[PDB]
């Protein structure tokens, strides 16, 4: 067992870093800490919006945050007021005139994190696990997506014994570098403990 | 020397009962053949090209001639009904008339149109097949 992170395996090629900036040893730690704090706040807030990715850029004493959301309607609001207060929040947190940006993800069925949170919510709502997994994999397969794989951790249906479910279809070549496999993990909290869901989606090559 | 297809290397088990699956291989061979004659081959470094060359060679050896069949055939011509018993069974199962150049060790009942002759003796096969193809060409 003990498969490695599919994203960390492809940082060099076919995948790109979430945080894109340079800093010396003198100030690496501070920037990293503030970046982590920003990510924490944003993930805590915008969960309802269907968060996908948070990109952090720095050019010169300024931050350019990009947020990938399924539905920008939630984040922006009725006439672009919500974002404003959101901006202010970040502006209050770290006083370097951040510039928030929102991007909408095309066909949300082809984003592993979104599938992950969807399945997690289904689990949290006491759904049937196996049926939900088949539905999810089929839904992913409908929209191109040359491969799909979904794994659920354990403690299925409040049972006394934990067990992995697992289901996949298509091609999921985890061993090839030129794969561009999108990965997503979600955690579901229920009355009988925590469950982990993983989703891999395979989209073309080269 | 005719439009008719042929199988002359080895009868892959299921060319008729599993025609769709073999048609998948026909499609694959077509796609490879197209790819090698395309100016997009500069990707896929030399070793992968060599692997694809091996694959293409294999599919060419085995599936050549069969490529002509866009669908199920209308009849089958077999040199030896016993050596090619599998093909006979498939044709029988799919209501495809069978023509055989049988010999002393064959089953007449399994062939609709039988030519009692020789299976060895290159001369005999040459004569029979030449006459048959000439009749094919003449009647077009």
């Amino acid at each position: 067992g003990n498969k490695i992170h599919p994203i960390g395996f492809r940082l060099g090629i076919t995948r790109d870093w979430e945080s894109r900036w340079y800093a010396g040893k003198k100030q690496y730690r501070h920037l990293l800490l503030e970046d982590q704090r920003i990510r924490g706040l944003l993930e805590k807030e915008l969960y309802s919006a269907g968060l996908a990715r948070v990109d952090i850029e720095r050019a010169a004493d300024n931050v350019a945050v990009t947020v990938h959301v399924a539905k920008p309607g939630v984040v922006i609001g009725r006439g672009g007021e919500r974002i404003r207060v959101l901006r202010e929040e970040l502006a209050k947190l770290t006083g370097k005139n951040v510039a928030l940006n929102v991007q909408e993800v095309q066909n949300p069925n082809l984003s592993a994190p979104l599938v992950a949170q969807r399945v997690a919510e289904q689990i949290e709502r006491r759904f049937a696990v196996r049926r939900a997994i088949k539905q999810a994999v089929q839904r992913v397969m409908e929209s191109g997506a040359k491969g799909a794989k979904v794994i659920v951790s354990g403690r299925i249906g409040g049972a006394e014994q934990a067990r992995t479910e697992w289901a996949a279809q298509g091609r999921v070549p985890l061993h090839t570098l030129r794969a561009n496999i999108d990965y997503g993990f979600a955690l579901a909290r229920t009355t009988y403990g925590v469950l982990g869901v993983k989703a891999y989606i395979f989209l073309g090559e080269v | 020397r005719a439009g008719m297809p042929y199988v002359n290397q080895r009868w892959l088990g299921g060319m008729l009962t599993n025609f769709k699956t073999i048609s998948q291989r026909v499609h694959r061979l077509e796609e490879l053949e197209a790819l090698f004659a395309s100016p997009e081959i500069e990707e896929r470094p030399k070793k992968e090209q060599v692997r694809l060359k091996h694959e293409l060679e294999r599919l060419q050896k085995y599936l050549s001639g069969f490529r002509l069949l866009k669908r199920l055939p209308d009849a089958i011509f077999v040199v030896d009904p016993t050596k090619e018993a599998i093909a006979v069974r498939e044709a029988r199962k799919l209501f495809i008339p069978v023509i055989a150049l049988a010999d002393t060790d064959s089953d007449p009942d399994l062939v609709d149109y039988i030519i009692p002759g020789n299976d060895d003796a290159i001369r005999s096969i040459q004569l029979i097949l030449s006459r048959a193809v000439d009749l094919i060409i003449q009647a077009r």
């Binding site: 960390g8 894109r20 990293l32 982590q36 990510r39 | -």
Partner: protein, 60 residues
């Protein structure tokens, strides 16, 4: 990794030598690196998640 222990490290302890380093993510004080200010587990997790600019898997 008690909470009280976490806040105890964020005050000047009347002398220099009592000061030390804790992980800024989990409050571990056993495998923290000066460069990042993270424990080895958190470092590995964040590196795999691709949230460390320029940090990549090494092979040579």
């Amino acid at each position: 990794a008690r909470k009280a222990l976490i806040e105890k490290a964020k005050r000047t302890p009347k002398f220099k030598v009592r000061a030390y380093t804790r992980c800024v993510r989990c409050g571990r004080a056993r495998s923290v690196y000066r460069f990042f200010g993270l424990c080895r587990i958190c470092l590995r997790e964040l590196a795999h998640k691709g949230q460390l600019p320029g940090v990549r898997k090494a092979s040579w």
